[PDB]
Every structure is written in structure tokens, then in C-alpha cells.
């Protein structure tokens, strides 16, 4: 039945994305430098997330610390010691009243910021890889046992379960309309899920190795995936095919984090070669190089109104770029 | 008081040594997730045994990049699953994020190996000790030592041991091996070699 799917995908392929963006003006060289440097963590930084107020962010390190940073003044508003030292993700609530984390303990820990712990969601089997808030009462998590789940924070029970992946789920991204989300996993595939229904919609198979990060385009109709085959790929939900492939003949390392800008023009990809790249999403050409980390760049995030880009690496340092 | 109270915690992060415990089901690594803290010569070692996840280990093992040492426990008496243990040792030795972490190798279950001798690998016939139990022990040890000296000898080293089920001096060996593991780190950090 997949032969008919591939035949329909070939029949719906008229012209490439780079042909539609062929005779357009390129951005050119992107020059960015570090404005603020945060140094308050001992072990490697594994994850971060920005606030919706575009000022405060959160960061998670392998030493057992979750620190809320004020990006403007390089000050620590809060610092939380964690019961488990290994945390793979952290999310900061859009209302700012709660924070979440999780990792190798297979528990999603949610703390109140009125700092006290509020809830411990315990239903997963494998290592919890990503989590994102929908509201103060619902949360979407993904774990390493090839599952995702939508949880109610009040009763502490799973509301829906998403079981379609054959590999360990590495990342998830939420749509701006909060009606769909995407998940990238370790079977070289990404899946689109409906929050309200609870069933998979579409499956995208264009990569060749384990997909580590995923992020929606700002219009909600496209996404980008970075994987261990040293290539990024841009997919569309309507065209049912890979729109773009961002590759190079000199990159032989994996991809750890991708994120989009405010307009979606620049794709910000973190690599294992101690540096990040700034690709053009339309021209499929590299336009910027950010090299300020002495170890592997683990996490990357974009300010909600596009004023800054904050990266965190395995050299225990957070760097904000403008 | 966020900045001051963190700094004392840094002293705690300078006080303990983290260890990664690995082994198969037949190997008695619980006798040699679960956390075990033990103190030798007023130095705290904190070993982690991970068993709450699946059998795919290529994505969470990167959480143990800054670990001091990997204690790898091998049941020597199991000739059927010895090749799987050798393949696991080869995978941990040749990993990209584990290429700077030294492995303390514990060849457990010596008494059952001696009973199997006194009661798979075709190269055992043309072997000589560097008295059958000694030949079997050093053949099994050199099977791992060939993988250890095949590549990556400069960045990290292997420390084999022979251990029975009634042995109590394993923490002594872990102390001494971690002391040499960082001693060689400090000799290169301090511009001496």
C-alpha cells in the first residue's frame, strides 16, 4: 500500500522548492556575536526553554540543577535542586506559573513558581526525552519507550497515549494553534498527532538515521528535522514530501538541535562540530556560523519575538546571541 | 543567596566521583535505577546501575560522558554469552562519547570457572600462559585486552581484575584504579606530560 503512497507523492511533485526560490535575493552573510554569557552551572547543559515574556528562560544541567535565568541582567531568579541528576528536558509554562522537567528517572516533575514541587507524573517506561506545556492543566510528554502521552496535571493521570513510533522518541514540537503536534524519533521518521482525537495523521520518511530535533515553521504548515546523517530536512504537511534538504560536503557530524526564527527565513541548527549554523530555509544555503562553544552544543532556543538566540553546550555555558 | 549556596554545592560536586556500572544478566554486578554510595579513605564514590530503560542504549549512554570510570562486570564461566560480552566491551571501548573514559574490568565468578576447568574460541589451543585454570583465566583476560590494546590506548586504559563471589576488596581496587585514572589526567593537565 506504500507503493501507492509513493506513486501519489511522485504524482503530486510538480517542481522543487529551490526552483520556486531560484530568482530571489539571498540574505547573505549573517554576522552574530555573543551579548550575554551565563556561567552558573557545573556539569553539561542538556536542555533549555524560553519564556513567553521573552525575558526569563530556564536551563537544565546534568549536575542536578534547574536554573531560571534573567537574560537581560544575567541574574538567577530561581535555582532548583532536582531529585534525579539526569534530566533530558525542561519546559517553562506560557503563563509562567509552573516549570517542568524529566529524564532517566521516568518521572515528569512539575514545580510551582508562586518554589515547591507540585506534581510527579509517573506512567512512562523509557527515558523521558521531551515535554511541552499546553495550558497549566495539560502537558504533552514523550519518552524513550516509543510512546508519547497527553497528561492532565490535576488528577495526575494520562489523558491520551500516542503509540505509533518504532523507535525511541527524541523530540516533539507543538503547533501554535494547540490542535496538532509533531514527534521525531529514532526510526528515521516523524509523525503528526492530533491532540483532541488521539490518533496519528501522517508519517514522513525522508531521513537516514536517528532524528534528534523537530520544530514547526511559524505558520504551522511545515517543520524541519535534524538527524545524525549530517543533513537537515524541511517537510510540509500539505505537500506530503520533503521540501528542502540542507546538507554539505564537509559536515560528517550529527545534529542536536534545530529551531526557527520569527519569519521562518533562518533555520538555526546545532551540530556536534562545536558550532551552530544559520541556514536559509528558502535558498537552502548556509548563511551564518556561530562558533563559541568548546564542547558539543546540546540545546538551542529562540526568543519568542525574535530578539535573541540562546544556545547551551556541554561546556557548561549558556550563550545569548543577537 | 542563590549564588553563594550554589558554590558550596560545587564543593560537593568536587567531592564525589561518579561511576557507571555495566554488565549482563548472568554477571553478578549487584554483588560487586539503583544508586550505591560507598566511601573509601574519606573519598565518596557514587555508582549507578541503570535497568529501568529498554535494551537500546545508544541514546542515554551519552548521559555518562563526564563519568570517572566504567566498571564492566563479565561472567567468565559463561562460554555461550562470552562473545556477547566481548561485543559489548568493544562497543563501549569504541564509542565516540566514551573514548576518554577508562574501564575497570571485573571478571566475576572465578570459582565456577575453576570448577568448569577441573570438570567456542578456536584460538585457545595455540595459547601459552604469560595449571589449566591459570591458562583459561589469562586467555579470557587477554581476549578483552586485545580489544583494549587494539585502538584508543592513549586516551584511556583498561584495568582487569579476577574476582570471586566471596571477594570483598573490590572497593580497594576501584579506589586504586580511579587514583591512577586521574593521576594520568593530572600529569597531562599540569603540563608535565
Amino acid at each position: 500500500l506504500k507503493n501507492q503512497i509513493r506513486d501519489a507523492r511522485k504524482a503530486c511533485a510538480d517542481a522543487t522548492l529551490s526552483q520556486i526560490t531560484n530568482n530571489i535575493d539571498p540574505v547573505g552573510r549573517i554576522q552574530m556575536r555573543t551579548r550575554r554569557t551565563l556561567r552558573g552551572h557545573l556539569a553539561k547543559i542538556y536542555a533549555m526553554h524560553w519564556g513567553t515574556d521573552s525575558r526569563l528562560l530556564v536551563s537544565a544541567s546534568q549536575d542536578g540543577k534547574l536554573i531560571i535565568w534573567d537574560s537581560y541582567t544575567t541574574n538567577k531568579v530561581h535555582a532548583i535542586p532536582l531529585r534525579s541528576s539526569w534530566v533530558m528536558t525542561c519546559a517553562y509554562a506560557p503563563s509562567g506559573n509552573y516549570v517542568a522537567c524529566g529524564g532517566l528517572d521516568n518521572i515528569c516533575s512539575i514545580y510551582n513558581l508562586k518554589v515547591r514541587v507540585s506534581r510527579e507524573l509517573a506512567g512512562h517506561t523509557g527515558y523521558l526525552s521531551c515535554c511541552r506545556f499546553l495550558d497549566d492543566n495539560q502537558i504533552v510528554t514523550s519518552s524513550g519507550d516509543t510512546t508519547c502521552a497527553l497528561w492532565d496535571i490535576e488528577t495526575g493521570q494520562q489523558t491520551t497515549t500516542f503509540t505509533g513510533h518504532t523507535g525511541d522518541v527524541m523530540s516533539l514540537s507543538l503547533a501554535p494553534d494547540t490542535r496538532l503536534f509533531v514527534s521525531g524519533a529514532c526510526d528515521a521518521s516523524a509523525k503528526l498527532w492530533d491532540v483532541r482525537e488521539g490518533m496519528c495523521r501522517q508519517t514522513f520518511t525522508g531521513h537516514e538515521s536517528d532524528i534528534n530535533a523537530i520544530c514547526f515553521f511559524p505558520n504551522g504548515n511545515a517543520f524541519a528535522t535534524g538527524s545524525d546523517d549530517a543533513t537537515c530536512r524541511l517537510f510540509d504537511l500539505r505537500a506530503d514530501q520533503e521540501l528542502m534538504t540542507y546538507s554539505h560536503d564537509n559536515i560528517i557530524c550529527g545534529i542536536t538541535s534545530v529551531s526557527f526564527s520569527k519569519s521562518g527565513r533562518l533555520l538555526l541548527a546545532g551540530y556536534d562540530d562545536f558550532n551552530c549554523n544559520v541556514w536559509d530555509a528558502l535558498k537552502a544555503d548556509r548563511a551564518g556560523v556561530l562558533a563559541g562553544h568548546d564542547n558539543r552544543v546540546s540545546c538551542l532556543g529562540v526568543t519568542d519575538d525574535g530578539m535573541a538566540v540562546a544556545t547551551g553546550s556541554w561546556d557548561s555555558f549558556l550563550k545569548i546571541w543577537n | 543567596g542563590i549564588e553563594k549556596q550554589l558554590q558550596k554545592d560545587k564543593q560537593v560536586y568536587r567531592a564525589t566521583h561518579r561511576l557507571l556500572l555495566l554488565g549482563a544478566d548472568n554477571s553478578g554486578k549487584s554483588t560487586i535505577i539503583f544508586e550505591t554510595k560507598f566511601q573509601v579513605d574519606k573519598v565518596n564514590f557514587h555508582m549507578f546501575d541503570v535497568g529501568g530503560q529498554r535494551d537500546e542504549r545508544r541514546k542515554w549512554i551519552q548521559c555518562f560522558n563526564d563519568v570517572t570510570a566504567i566498571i564492566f562486570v563479565v561472567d567468565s564461566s559463561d562460554y555461550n554469552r562470552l562473545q556477547e560480552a566481548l561485543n559489548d566491551f568493544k562497543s563501549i571501548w569504541n564509542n565516540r562519547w566514551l573514548r576518554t573514559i577508562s574501564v575497570i574490568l571485573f571478571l566475576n565468578k572465578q570459582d565456577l570457572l575453576a570448577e568448569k576447568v577441573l570438570a567456542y574460541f578456536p584460538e585457545f589451543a595455540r595459547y601459552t600462559t604469560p595449571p589449566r585454570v591459570t591458562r583459561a583465566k589469562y586467555f579470557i583476560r587477554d581476549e578483552f585486552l586485545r580489544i583494549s590494546t587494539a585502538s584508543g590506548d592513549g586516551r584511556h586504559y583498561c584495568y582487569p581484575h579476577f574476582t570471586c563471589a566471596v571477594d570483598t576488596e573490590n572497593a580497594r581496587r576501584i579506589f586504586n584504579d580511579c587514583k591512577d585514572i586521574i593521576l594520568q589526567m593530572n600529569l597531562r593537565e599540569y603540563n608535565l606530560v
Epitope: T166, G167, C186, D187, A188, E208, S209, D210, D228, D229, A230, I252, G254 | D55, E56, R57, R58, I61, E84, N87, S91, N94, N95, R96
Partner: nanobody, 115 residues
């Protein structure tokens, strides 16, 4: 979408969906009633070749990057060699843990061999 299809005495593994010259290729059996067991491995350029000691000197493993296929030439077989055979690829290019795993996405469906 990656794809590995086995056929098969000489076993063949045809590869699709991925570039073939940048991955190390492995052969893994599964005996009836036993677990998955690693058999042989070959590197990216075909330089480093390793076998299990049970089949050392009896099996040969080769690759064809022009045809993008993996051959196992097996002869002087034994009744203990009756197993289901899979060709495995480990995911990181230019490098390899979980090829002998219970649920692995980068290996084929395998072929039955009865001696």
C-alpha cells in the same frame, strides 16, 4: 525510508533508501528458541572484517558499493547453523551499539536457513 531485503549457499542483502559507502554492515543470526546473536561485521571500505569464533575460517562477508549490496558466502555448514539471518546497519555514519537488539528499525526481515 530505508530498506534492507534479504535473499537466500550465499545470502544477499539489498539496500535502499540510504547511501551505502558510509555505514558498517553486519550479519546477525537468530536461532530457533534462542536470542539474537551477532555473527559477522565489515567496515565502510571493507578493510576491517570480524567473525564469531564459531564460524571463523568458514564464513566470508563482502560488500559491493557499486551494486550497494552485502553478501555472505557460507560453506561447509553445520546443523547448528539453521537460523533466521538479518543484515544490520548501525545508525551513525563514519563511525555502533544496538544492531543486535530485540526491536531494531535498521535491519531487514531476514531469511530462514535450514541445514
Amino acid at each position: 525510508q530505508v530498506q534492507l531485503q534479504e535473499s537466500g549457499l550465499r545470502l544477499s542483502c539489498a539496500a535502499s533508501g540510504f547511501t551505502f559507502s558510509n555505514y558498517k554492515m553486519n550479519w546477525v543470526r537468530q536461532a530457533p528458541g534462542k536470542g539474537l546473536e551477532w555473527v559477522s561485521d565489515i567496515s565502510q571500505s571493507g578493510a576491517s572484517i570480524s567473525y564469531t569464533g564459531s564460524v571463523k575460517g568458514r564464513f566470508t562477508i563482502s560488500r559491493d558499493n557499486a551494486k550497494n549490496t552485502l553478501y555472505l558466502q557460507m560453506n561447509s555448514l553445520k546443523p547448528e547453523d539453521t537460523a533466521v539471518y538479518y543484515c544490520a546497519r548501525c545508525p551513525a555514519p563514519f563511525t555502533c551499539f544496538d544492531v543486535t537488539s530485540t526491536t531494531y528499525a535498521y535491519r531487514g526481515q531476514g531469511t530462514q536457513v535450514t541445514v
